[PDB]
Amino acid sequence: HSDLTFCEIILMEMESHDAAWPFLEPVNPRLVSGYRRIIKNPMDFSTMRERLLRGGYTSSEEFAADALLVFDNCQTFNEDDSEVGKAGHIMRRFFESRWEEFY
Numbered sequence: 001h002s003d004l005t006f007c008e009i010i011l012m013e014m015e016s017h018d019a020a021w022p023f024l025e026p027v028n029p030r031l032v033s034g035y036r037r038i039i040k041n042p043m044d045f046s047t048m049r050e051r052l053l054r055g056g057y058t059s060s061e062e063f064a065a066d067a068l069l070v071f072d073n074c075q076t077f078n079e080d081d082s083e084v085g086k087a088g089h090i091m092r093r094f095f096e097s098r099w100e101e102f103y
């Protein structure tokens with residue numbers, strides 16, 4: 001129970017983060033040229049919210065995997081100095097910090 005409750009705590013805190021804006025909704029490949037081709041497994045906070053709400057995480061590890069996928073995707077598609085990339089670095093470091101401060 002504590003696994004998914006912390007997952008809920010951190011997910012809520014990421015969803016409400018100032019730097020969360022590139023990750024609140026799935027990237028729309030029709031608006032982002034090359035995204036479909038470059039990013040094999042899209043992931044975003046709302047998709048993680050949907051899976052978490054639907055009970056779809058077996059362990060806290062799977063939730064962390066989806067989160068890390070959000071940020072791996074971000075770093076794969078965006079320059080580190082891009083606005084989305086910079087936000088992704090803030091969000092990634094935030095996630096890793098929060099994750100480690102519990103686990």
Ligand SMILES: NC1CCN(C(=O)c2ccc(=O)[nH]c2)CC1
Pocket residue numbers: 021022023024025026027032073074077078084
């Ligand atoms: N509604 C938001 C605004 C724009 N937005 C991006 O531009 C983006 C995010 C991640 C990425 O990898 N590439 C582009 C995220 C969705």
